[PDB]
């Protein structure tokens, strides 16, 4: 029963990360003590996804070093694919049902000879690798601990059966990233269906703000968002639970009570749910991928009832540690006696807020534009609710300069209570 | 009338077009630039109002015909960003037909124009809400003289670029006829294909239509 | 409690008056004996006011030499502002309530580790610096000796509360100059209200 294991195995060291020296063989037991498999720690299994060349991709010799820097004295097993993945795509879409059985036989061998606990096994998966890890685990003697899927495959695995894809019953805890879900239903590269216990949509999941290397740009963010979560142990990147992509832009759903607002990546909290769990956050185009989240509610008031549209504002943020000066945002359908809310983000740490400017800029540039007296409003209060630290401050002004007018000097608000 | 496609000299860019469109009309005596009467800005983009009867379709600039009216008279045309400010105007009506009822949106097409004098090859346009058993119309313009139309390609391009994208069999339709109405010379030609290659499919080879009658 | 002290500190010598070589750090005690802080004499703390460029003004490298000529073998500590003062004026009118707390934490650290007397401390203040020294001192463990304010700020600090400005209860002895008090009530550059124990109006 141990000659149909052509999908090989390997074990890599922190001193040698880019090679495949010490192999493991299912059935031969003189090699397990040859690769120095430490029987006390956890075990990472990294399953390779699709490829078109003969070698590995470029993210595996970085993910090996990241795992060996975050969790020292552990086990990272690299599964091999290079006689089965270099094909066309419906050809390699059928080999997952065999490679998952090979991995299941290997794990049952390790759990039935050496009495391995199967309680400290992470199953990392790329686009085909996540479905490989999903078809594994269901064919084990008991439940595996955690399967992490990084932007799984879309086309032939959507509309399929639950024992055919990465289903939420495959393990005890499954988290799935959804970086590249742009396209029609059934014709997308990533999968559009929520499949895990926790389902994170970074930037909504349509694309990523960085787009042959440029061709696969927003398909490698599901690895570069995980390497960053392994490196930044002390600083987690929170993700926020909402109900739709359009509602998160209005900022009505920054609520972190009753099993909401989980983390993203390795430091996620094991929380089970009853249904699909869509979660949201925003990112940045560089190697620190953390941004903060602020909610701003603005009360408009005045006398002259005049509606407008597509007005551009500029706001500042003045706090204890540092400051943010020229954040732009727009609001359509501004009018009197309303209460508007939106979402605001930044990449500079603030601390606790002190003051806040508010400028309503002018689209016109001509020397004509100083006349034809500009529209204005009477702003009383701004409610600000921070994202992580749940503080709800109140801002107001004095009984002077409380009149925002387009193309004029901005108002300045202070801490009001 | 919102802006002009060319935008301290850059500050007053679209305020001097009302002089550079008149100097061009004074210089080009033999070649007038017609302007077309419609009822709203949104309706002119659909091309439903290229009608040159009953005191419509006047000229622009110095060579305008003295025609009085009863009310306000809004008229429309398009231009180009250089010193010859004349473009032609073509109306294209497309009949979609098929079997599989599946609506789509924001699909990008590419069309060509093959005529007697010269040719136009890669004119882009988009159409939202494409579906079976409908009849869609739009407006099309160019800057190269054609003459009389002979043939017309029609290509529905693919947004995806991956090597994955050759599979998951692409949506397609069955196009029968295209009615083309030219702007200046009021000719209403009819285009069709043979009883082969009459199946436009996304990311495939384009169909080729000829003069049908 | 010693990483929110972004308003830095410095100590200058009579042989080097225009630079900022030897810094002091609240909490790190290997630097106090590095700058040769003489524990017997008095200590001057010069708080910088508003600015619009990036560097210091022109009167500080003269006031350093004047203090080191009048009181030799003493201590003149220059407080830094150059990441908080180069702003607009209602922006820099809110940072005094933080810089005064930073100076209060520094003085409580010096008075609770090295057992400094807090009886020989002069607090010199410019227009925003006088209100910075005034919001300091009220948040110390006991009374500081003398706060000298040199033409304090007028606009946003007039009509305010007594725990918000340079009040006469902030220290044991406070003297205030009033050189530029021209304008309407509430719209003046200097402050028109008498605030110190001694309030001098040169030329009115």
- Tokens 């990472």 correspond to A44
Q: Which helix (H) or strand (E) holds B23?
A: helix B17-27
Structural tokens at position A291 = 């941004």
Any alpha helices (H) in C50-146, and if so which ranges? Answer: 60-70, 89-92, 96-113, 127-135
Q: Has A151 been annotated as catalytic?
A: yes
Same-domain check for residues A105 and A245:
yes
Burial class (CB in 10 A: 0-12, 13-18, 19+), A343: buried
Cβ-based contacts of C94 with chain A (< 8 Å) = 318, 354-355, 414
Indicate the pairing of strand C121-125 with strand C43-47.
parallel
C94–A321: do the CB atoms touch at under 8 Å?
no
Structural domain of C143: 1-204
Question: Among A49, A88, A89, A182, which would you mutate to test the B interface (most chain B Cβ atoms within 10 Å of its Cβ)?
Answer: A89
Q: Are A277 and A353 part of one and the same domain?
A: no
List chain C residues with CB under 8 Å of A355.
90-91, 94
Same domain membership, residue A349 and residue A207: no
The yes-or-no answer on residue A88 being catalytic is no
Chains A and B, touching by 3 or more CB pairs within 8 angstroms: yes
Number of domains in chain C: 1
* Selected catalytic residue, list A7, A48, A102, A151: A151
Q: In this complex, is the C-beta atom of A396 within 8 Å of any C-beta atom belonging to chain C?
A: no
In 3D space, the residue among B146, B147, B130, B151 whose CA is nearest the CA of residue B193 turns out to be B151
Q: Tokens for A374?
A: 């500009």
**Could you tell me the CA-to-CA distances from A184 to A199, A218, B159, C102 in Å, in that order?**
20, 17, 11, 58
Q: Which two tokens stand for residue C50?
A: 């508003």
Q: Which residues of B touch A183 (CB under 8 A)?
A: 160
Sequence-separated (6 or more) residues with CB below 8 Å from residue B212:
B177, B190, B191, B192
Nearest to B164 among A89, A184, A186 (CB): A89
Q: How far is CA A25 from CA A29, A95, A109, A110, in A?
A: 8, 20, 11, 11
Q: Which of C151, C164, C169, C175 is catalytic?
A: C151
Cα A29 from Cα A44, distance rounded (Å)? 20
* Beta-carbon separation of C91 and A414 below 8 A: no
Q: Which residues of chain A from 315 to 344 reach within 8 Å of chain C, CB to CB?
A: 318, 320-321
- Cβ <8 Å between A155 and B164: yes
How many Cα atoms occupy the beta-carbon half-sphere of A218 within 13 Å? 23
**Does residue A417 sit in the same domain as residue A314?**
yes
Interhelix angle A96-113/A127-135, rounded to 10 degrees, is 50
Verify that A77 and A222 share a domain, yes or no: yes
| C-alpha dist (Å) from residue A303 to A4, A103, A376, B39 | 81, 71, 10, 36
State which of A281, A315, A330 marks the end of a domain.
A281
Smallest Cβ distance to C91: which of A318, A320, A321? A318
Same domain, A33 and A147: yes
Query: What is the per-residue burial (b if ≥16 Cβ within 10 Å, else e) of A289-308?
Result: bbebbbbbbbebebeeeeee
The minimum CA-CA distance between B168 and chain A, rounded to whole Å, is 7
Q: Using CB atoms, which residue from B11, B161, B168 is nearest to A187? A: B168
Domain-located, residue A208: yes
CA torsion A106-A109-A110-A112 (nearest 10°) is 150
Burial class (CB in 10 A: 0-12, 13-18, 19+), B123: middle
Nearest CA in chain C to A400: C156
Q: Are residues A265 and A308 in the same domain?
A: no
Query: Is the four-CA dihedral A203, A209, A214, A215 of positive or negative sign?
Result: positive
Nearest CB to A355 within list C4, C6, C94? C94
Interface residue A22 vs chain C (CB under 8 A): no
Q: Does A24 touch chain B (CB under 8 A)?
A: no
Quote the tokens at residue B78. Answer: 């398009």
Q: Which residues contact B68 (CB under 8 A, 6 or more apart)?
A: none
Measured between CA atoms, the residue of chain A closest to residue C3 is A321
Q: Say if CB C96 and CB C160 are below 8 A apart.
A: no
Q: What is the resolution of this structure in A?
A: 3.8
Record: contact B168-A186, CB cut-off 8 A: yes
Closest chain A C-alpha to C129 CA, distance in angstroms: 19
How close is the nearest chain A Cα to the Cα of B107, in Å?
12
Q: Is A102 a catalytic residue?
A: no
- B162: which chain A residues are within 8 Å (Cβ-Cβ)? 189, 215
Residues 6+ apart with CB under 8 A from A391: A352, A385
How distant, in Å, are the alpha carbons of A212, A241, B35, B90, C31 from that of C114?
65, 52, 90, 90, 13
What are the chain A neighbours of B164 within 8 Å (beta carbons)? Answer: 89, 155, 189
Whole-number Å distance between alpha carbons of B211 and B114: 11
Same domain? For A133 and A189 the reply is: yes
Residues A259 and A368 in one domain: no
Whether residue A401 lies within 8 A of chain C, CB to CB, comes out as: no
Cβ-Cβ contacts under 8 Å, A90 against chain B: 167
Tell me which residue in B104, B161, B167 faces A215 most closely, judged by beta carbons.
Answer: B161
Does any CB of chain C come closer than 8 Å to the CB of residue A214? no
- Please name the residue ranges forming H helices in A40-185: 60-70, 89-92, 96-113, 127-135
Does A55 lie at the interface with C, CB-CB under 8 angstroms?
no
Burial grade of A109 (CB within 10 A; 0-12, 13-18, 19 or more): middle
DSSP β-bridge partners for residue C102:
none
A167 belongs to an annotated ligand binding site: yes
Q: Looking at chain A, which residue has its C-alpha nearest residue C160?
A: A398
> With the C-alpha atoms ordered A225, A230, A231, A235, is the resulting torsion angle positive or negative?
positive
Q: What is the DSSP string of A288-304?
A: ----EEEEEEEEE--SS
Question: 3-state class of B30 per DSSP?
Answer: coil
Residue A311 lies in a domain: yes
**Chain B: partners with 3+ C-beta pairs within 8 Å:** A
Q: HSE-up of A91 (CA within 13 Å, CB side)?
A: 9
CB distance from C160 to chain A under 8 Å? Answer: no
Annotated catalytic residue within A48, A122, A178, A219: A219
Helix axes A221-231, A60-70, angle to 10 degrees: 20
- In a domain, residue A286? The reply is no
- What's the farthest any 2 CA atoms get from each other in chain C? 52
Buried b (16+ CB within 10 A) or exposed e, A220-237: bbbbbbbbbbbebeeebb
Question: Tokens 């000066």, residue?
Answer: A325
Query: Under an 8 A CB cutoff, do B162 and A52 touch?
Result: no
Helix (H, G, I), strand (E, B) or coil at A144: coil
If you measure CA to CA, which chain C residue comes closest to A398? C156
Smallest CA-to-CA distance from A156 within A88, A81, A225 is with A88
Single residue among A257, A281, A305 that ends a domain in this structure: A281
């Amino acid at each position: 029963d141990f000659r149909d294991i052509e999908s090989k195995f390997a074990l890599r060291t922190p001193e040698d990360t880019a090679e495949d020296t010490c192999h493991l063989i299912p059935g031969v037991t003189e090699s397990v003590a040859n690769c120095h498999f430490n029987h006390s720690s956890k075990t990472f299994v990294v399953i390779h996804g699709w490829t078109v060349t003969g070698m590995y991709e470029s993210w595996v010799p970085k993910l090996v070093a990241a795992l060996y820097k975050r969790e020292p004295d552990s086990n990272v097993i690299v599964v091999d694919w290079l006689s089965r993945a270099q094909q066309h795509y419906p050809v390699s879409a059928g080999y997952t049902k065999l490679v998952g059985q090979d991995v299941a036989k290997f794990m049952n061998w390790m759990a039935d000879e050496f009495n391995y606990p199967l309680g400290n096994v992470h199953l990392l998966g790329y686009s085909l690798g996540a479905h490989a890890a999903g078809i594994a685990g269901s064919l084990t003697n008991k439940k595996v601990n955690r399967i992490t899927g990084l932007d799984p495959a879309g086309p032939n695995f959507e509309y399929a059966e639950a024992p055919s894809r990465l289903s939420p019953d495959d393990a005890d805890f499954v988290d799935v990233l959804h970086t590249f879900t742009r396209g029609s239903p059934g014709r997308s590269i990533g999968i559009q269906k929520p499949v895990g216990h926790v389902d994170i949509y970074p930037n909504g999941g349509t694309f990523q703000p960085g787009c042959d290397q440029l061709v696969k740009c927003s398909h490698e963010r599901s690895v570069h968002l995980f390497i960053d979560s392994l490196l930044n142990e002390e600083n987690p990147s929170k993700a926020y639970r909402c109900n739709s992509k359009e509602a998160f832009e209005k900022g009505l759903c920054l609520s972190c009570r009753k099993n909401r607002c989980n983390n993203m990546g390795y430091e996620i909290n094991k929380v089970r749910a009853k249904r699909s769990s869509k979660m949201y956050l925003k990112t940045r185009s560089q190697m620190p991928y953390k941004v903060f989240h602020y909610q701003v509610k603005i009360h408009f008031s005045g006398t002259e009832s005049n509606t407008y549209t597509n007005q551009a504002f500029e706001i500042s943020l003045y706090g204890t540690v540092a400051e943010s000066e020229n954040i732009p945002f727009t609001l359509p359908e501004v009018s009197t006696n309303k209460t508007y809310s939106f979402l605001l983000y930044t990449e500079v740490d603030i601390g606790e807020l002190l003051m806040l400017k508010l400028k309503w800029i002018s689209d016109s540039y001509f020397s004509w534009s100083n006349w034809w007296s500009s529209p204005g409003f009477d702003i009383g209060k701004i409610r600000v609710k921070a994202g992580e630290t749940q503080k709800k401050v109140i801002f107001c002004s004095r009984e002077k300069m409380s009149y925002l007018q387009k193309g004029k000097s901005p108002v300045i608000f202070v801490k009001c209570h």
